[PDB]
Design a protein around this motif. Structure first.
Motif, PDB file in Angstrom:
ATOM      1  N   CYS B  56       2.498  -8.437 -36.638  1.00  0.00           N
ATOM      2  CA  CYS B  56       3.772  -9.063 -36.279  1.00  0.00           C
ATOM      3  C   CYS B  56       3.979  -8.899 -34.774  1.00  0.00           C
ATOM      4  O   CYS B  56       4.335  -9.854 -34.071  1.00  0.00           O
ATOM      5  CB  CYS B  56       4.932  -8.415 -37.028  1.00  0.00           C
ATOM      6  SG  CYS B  56       6.553  -9.035 -36.511  1.00  0.00           S
ATOM      7  N   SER B  57       3.748  -7.674 -34.309  1.00  0.00           N
ATOM      8  CA  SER B  57       3.844  -7.327 -32.912  1.00  0.00           C
ATOM      9  C   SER B  57       2.762  -6.327 -32.540  1.00  0.00           C
ATOM     10  O   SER B  57       2.256  -5.606 -33.390  1.00  0.00           O
ATOM     11  CB  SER B  57       5.198  -6.707 -32.621  1.00  0.00           C
ATOM     12  OG  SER B  57       5.335  -5.518 -33.358  1.00  0.00           O
ATOM     13  N   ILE B  58       2.399  -6.319 -31.264  1.00  0.00           N
ATOM     14  CA  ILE B  58       1.439  -5.385 -30.738  1.00  0.00           C
ATOM     15  C   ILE B  58       2.204  -4.215 -30.130  1.00  0.00           C
ATOM     16  O   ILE B  58       2.953  -4.392 -29.163  1.00  0.00           O
ATOM     17  CB  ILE B  58       0.589  -6.027 -29.636  1.00  0.00           C
ATOM     18  CG1 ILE B  58      -0.151  -7.253 -30.161  1.00  0.00           C
ATOM     19  CG2 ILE B  58      -0.386  -5.016 -29.060  1.00  0.00           C
ATOM     20  CD1 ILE B  58      -1.103  -6.961 -31.297  1.00  0.00           C
ATOM     21  N   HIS B  59       2.029  -3.030 -30.702  1.00  0.00           N
ATOM     22  CA  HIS B  59       2.615  -1.819 -30.134  1.00  0.00           C
ATOM     23  C   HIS B  59       1.575  -0.816 -29.653  1.00  0.00           C
ATOM     24  O   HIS B  59       1.929   0.172 -29.011  1.00  0.00           O
ATOM     25  CB  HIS B  59       3.587  -1.159 -31.125  1.00  0.00           C
ATOM     26  CG  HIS B  59       2.922  -0.470 -32.275  1.00  0.00           C
ATOM     27  ND1 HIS B  59       2.577  -1.127 -33.439  1.00  0.00           N
ATOM     28  CD2 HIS B  59       2.570   0.829 -32.456  1.00  0.00           C
ATOM     29  CE1 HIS B  59       2.027  -0.264 -34.277  1.00  0.00           C
ATOM     30  NE2 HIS B  59       2.013   0.925 -33.704  1.00  0.00           N
ATOM     31  N   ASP B  60       0.298  -1.084 -29.922  1.00  0.00           N
ATOM     32  CA  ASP B  60      -0.773  -0.136 -29.611  1.00  0.00           C
ATOM     33  C   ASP B  60      -2.055  -0.919 -29.339  1.00  0.00           C
ATOM     34  O   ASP B  60      -2.729  -1.346 -30.267  1.00  0.00           O
ATOM     35  CB  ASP B  60      -0.941   0.861 -30.783  1.00  0.00           C
ATOM     36  CG  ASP B  60      -2.253   1.641 -30.742  1.00  0.00           C
ATOM     37  OD1 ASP B  60      -2.808   1.911 -29.644  1.00  0.00           O
ATOM     38  OD2 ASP B  60      -2.719   2.005 -31.848  1.00  0.00           O
ATOM     39  N   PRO B  61      -2.399  -1.096 -28.058  1.00  0.00           N
ATOM     40  CA  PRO B  61      -3.590  -1.863 -27.675  1.00  0.00           C
ATOM     41  C   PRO B  61      -4.906  -1.411 -28.320  1.00  0.00           C
ATOM     42  O   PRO B  61      -5.798  -2.229 -28.519  1.00  0.00           O
ATOM     43  CB  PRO B  61      -3.654  -1.663 -26.160  1.00  0.00           C
ATOM     44  CG  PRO B  61      -2.241  -1.387 -25.761  1.00  0.00           C
ATOM     45  CD  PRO B  61      -1.668  -0.588 -26.882  1.00  0.00           C
TER      46      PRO B  61
END
Ligand SMILES: N[C@@H](Cc1c[nH]c2ccccc12)C(=O)O
Ligand SMILES: N[C@@H](Cc1c[nH]c2ccccc12)C(=O)O
Ligand SMILES: N[C@@H](Cc1c[nH]c2ccccc12)C(=O)O
Ligand SMILES: N[C@@H](Cc1c[nH]c2ccccc12)C(=O)O
Ligand SMILES: [Mn+2]
Ligand SMILES: [Mn+2]
Ligand SMILES: [Mn+2]
Ligand SMILES: [Mn+2]
Lengths: 344, 342, 345, 348
Positions: B56-61
């Motif tokens: 849904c979203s990127i929080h940790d590359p």
């Protein structure tokens, strides 16, 4: 190649400071903006029972007519100052899904050139003159950049139906110096406007431009003076039962239950003669009780109706407005009605 | 003036980021052709299925790059049936308070460090393109695109901004194809309108690569399309698709569309994404010539968390886990192999 | 702490485009700037034998006065247009080691306030009016940033004795659209000016500001229309022998041997009356031969002398100038002498 | 406005990253800040005569290779530590020799030594080197030539120079008035000392000059003035390093109500542009320190790993601008000065 494939040109934009240097705000304009913003704040929070009337053209396409209209409105502003707080509509662009005129800022010359530098200068000059003659001004902020050119001259702002749900518009609102009205959605959704007030009241970080024209991170303090505007849906939503349902929902979300009713757009079903009917209905609410109503919006010009080309003076080229005669009628009606609310 | 502004802060311009992380030959080539390939899908010149799939979203590359490394294998494996492009969204817009996205809040602690965030976003995107995984994202404002749009192969305008004029004008200048979602209560007209508007030239105010305000004159975006993401009721089935396609053709725009398996179409239950996919697969066997793409909220691990405690698990909308992703993707691949024969 | 320790304030500076938008160059001003630059170039390179006369106030402190001065100067510009190419001195500041009034750009209000935005606007407004009435303008460029605000209105530029040796000023010259004169150094060193002409003729990369006020790298194309100015030293250097020795050195560096002579400053020993003596000596060189002389510089105002405070209209508050009477005489003298030099072609 | 008047002789205007872009990649560290801060105060003390150590600005004429520079600094650092009670050693880290002649235009301008111009890379390289130097314990000195480059790395500079060709320039004096570091003004190229004395005067007062913000936008900078300025004797037609020149300079400086503590350049015109003669000059300075020489607060030496010069950057650690003394001669010269100054400091 992957950069700017679908960009024809990037053009020079004078920064806000260029316009602010040429057209600095005057002592009088500041005073007027400052107190009109306070006065509206008092209406938003229930501390004063006057009716905020946001009235004037759908859009401004000719500043000369705008100033002549303002001169006339000013007499009624003074006359009704104990019942109504009258603030002129100074909107530069009607957002439009199709082609056609793109507003005064975009297309000040009304010929499809884009002379935004000239537009912004004209926009600021008109606003400064208006404030200088005692007429406070209101407008809709469409993007995140134009406000730096004239927000200091604005006493009340709108976020339109098409952008009330947009996060960056809510963020913008959260840093605007003026009270702000959020319209219900184009199909009548009130919750998006209630949420917007929620969002706009808190601090945000949004990206914009400094007065010097450089991109920057703006950390806002929140806007405590936001409210809802009922402008109709699939059906009109100006009557007592809509107002009362709106007021319940607002209280339910912990926000101000004082709202504004737009006599035009989807509340008149795009028939400008119906604006008077809506004002009649509002009049009737104020006489019975109408404690949740804090303002109304009316699309009004010197001459009634609309035209595709700007051939007739003082006649709208966007939405059809009521003429000056009807405008005097309407304001007298609302004044008479609210005087009786303020006595009770 | 600036009564309700707490602070105005230093913002590095796009050129600072572009100087440290210039796009590479390989990244440019991949973006360039993924855009062409998607354009072909939008205009009905290729019958593969576009799959926008990822968190849904990127929080940790780190997780994102891991996820990509698994997703790449499947991209290559299904390359004849599906054009797989990873979801690399940095924020999920929210009316209420909570985590504001990787760009805004790269440290996941309520500090704002937008400069770091934009750098992280560009670095992740560059690495993704360098390993062979193209990227898609949602553009929320008119400034952030200048920092990484060159690395983006497909763009979304969200349900909340599809009706917004300035977002349409942005899309008119975006180098990549763009998907417009129907509105949060199911209104499709606004997305059809948005496509029409986005295909025309506009003048909007934005920022140069150098961080200076300017007037941008766009050429128009011919590669726009709609995304069915449900409303008060879901709108993924064959009847809704058929009625959507009639409306699109009536407006003179592409009747090739994308279906979101998540969000309102799943009723915000991540388990139901597969039901939507199944339904889509079933349309692909029967006819389904108007479907050019699907959208899937997917991660290494299923569900959702309030804090970023568990590795590879969304902290925004709930996602299907890696398993359920192998299944959904096979299922779509199998079904479209049949389409492309018949 | 290591940054901006000794900085009191950084203040808002409107960019050139803001002034260019309020005061765009006119058709007539463009034509006049263009043509005058060409006409001056023809003198620098010996295609025309008219004498460039850079004449006017030491510094401009009052635009009204400057305009009135221009009006009178204009008549003489026209009158002598076949012998003399008259261009007005429009200098905004006299650089100074000591404290005092810092020029019109810095201190337009003449009260020790700084109002550089107003100053730059006034400077451009004046330059645009002067050109519009038919009077071309010259000035000293002191820094790398102010030229963006009005160089487009300048037909001839000077680099002062204090900056001729400065590399960044040479680089600036190399990108200026106008011919440029370099003065010999304040103790009479000529080599630095010859060196400067060499340097300015080549392409350079310097750092400056765009019209929009953003820092940028400017790659210049070189200025082929530079020349030296003899402005005295420990000794005056306006006589034939100094001229003849200056011309030898110029040819020896392979640069133009046509030079300009400043009748003021260290050539007059700061005693304004003596400008006429210098002009007289220049007239006498012209009559004999004077092939290497292509211009003169004169400090001139409506009213003669100088003053500490700006009390008397049209009188310099920087270096003392000759007044209008003596200006007519100096010009007639130069015109008469140069008519005779042009006839011997 | 049809006739052209604008940018007639401009070939191109190109993109320049602003200072903040470099400051973001290469922020100053705690250690570097501490070192810059105290080295400036220590130098201020020498300028105002509160400490009688000798400031030694020593290093290459120009930096053309950061690896060689770092290796040079490591060597100089051992002598900096060793002589810290007698000498305050600060490295010359000059990027570019001003030149009338065409040729190499310095590391900032032409970091690739090939006549390309990659000023963005050059400025990044300059900052990196200056940060690396301060982080290892070597403070740095440079010449500021234009009004813009200082915003990129002045925060890493402990002492600044205004060259002989710009000491008379008003904008350079105004620049010095707002520089965070002490500043030395050289006498003019033919030996004019009054211009440097005037420059100290001007630089000590407040000015308004036009420059660029950290964000790359033009701005007005109102300076506080620089109280830590002094003159540098670098010769003229004739050398000007001896006791009588020193004594005559000091009287002029006192007469002008400015500091009568000065620095002596051993190189350039004082050496007759002959690198071997730098030792001669230092020997004469050493002789002055043993006698009295109270007015001398510093010296300047052009020194590199390897002696002499070259036109092409063929040999490692050998100057491509002015010829320098090699490392052997440098250890000699510094021991000479240390020993001489140790005796001066003991007499008071
Ligand atoms: N100037 C606006 C607020 C604002 C909008 N955009 C900005 C960008 C930068 C700084 C402030 C703003 C006001 O006072 O209402
Ligand atoms: N750079 C974007 C287009 C764009 C978005 N915002 C801008 C602002 C300025 C210039 C270009 C843009 C692209 O290639 O898709
Ligand atoms: N505009 C100047 C040249 C110039 C000076 N400074 C600049 C900085 C940027 C670009 C051009 C310039 C001229 O035409 O004479
Ligand atoms: N930053 C420099 C001073 C300086 C030079 N140019 C500037 C422009 C703006 C602000 C400061 C400056 C210092 O600390 O020594
Ligand atoms: Mn309207
Ligand atoms: Mn989601
Ligand atoms: Mn003078
Ligand atoms: Mn040297």
């Amino acid at each position: 190649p992957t950069d700017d494939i679908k960009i024809k040109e990037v053009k020079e934009l004078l920064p806000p400071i260029a316009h602010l240097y040429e057209l600095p705000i005057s002592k009088e304009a500041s005073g007027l903006v400052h107190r009109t913003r306070q006065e509206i704040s008092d209406l938003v929070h229930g501390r004063d029972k006057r009716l905020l009337v946001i009235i004037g053209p759908c859009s401004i396409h000719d500043p000369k007519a705008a100033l002549e209209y303002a001169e006339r409105l000013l007499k009624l502003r003074k006359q009704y100052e104990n019942e109504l707080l009258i603030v002129m509509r100074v909107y530069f662009e009607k957002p439009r899904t199709t082609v056609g005129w793109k507003g005064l800022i975009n297309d000040p010359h009304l010929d499809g050139t884009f002379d935004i530098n000239f537009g912004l200068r004209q926009a600021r000059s008109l606003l400064l003159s208006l404030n200088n003659m005692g007429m406070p001004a209101s407008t809709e902020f469409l993007d995140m950049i134009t406000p730096q050119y004239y927000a200091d001259l604005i006493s009340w702002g709108a976020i339109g139906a098409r952008t009330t749900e947009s996060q960056v518009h809510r963020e913008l609102a959260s840093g605007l110096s003026c009270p702000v009205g959020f319209k219900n959605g184009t199909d009548g959704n009130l919750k998006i406007a209630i949420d917007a007030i929620g969002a706009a009241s808190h601090s945000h970080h949004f990206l914009s431009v400094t007065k010097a024209g450089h991109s920057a991170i703006v950390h806002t303090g929140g806007n405590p003076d936001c409210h809802v505007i009922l402008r109709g849906g699939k059906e009109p939503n100006y009557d007592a039962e809509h107002v009362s349902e709106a007021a319940e929902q607002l209280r339910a979300a912990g926000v101000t239950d004082k709202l504004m009713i737009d006599c035009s757009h989807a509340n008149s079903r795009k028939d400008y003669t119906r604006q008077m009917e809506v004002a009649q209905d509002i009049a009737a609410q104020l006489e019975q009780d109408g404690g949740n109503i804090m303002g109304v919006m009316v699309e009004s010009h010197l001459v009634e109706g609309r035209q595709d080309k700007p051939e007739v003076y003082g006649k709208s080229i966007t939405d059809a407005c009521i003429g000056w005669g009807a405008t005097e009628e309407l304001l007298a009606l609302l004044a008479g009605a609210n005087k009786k609310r303020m006595a009770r």
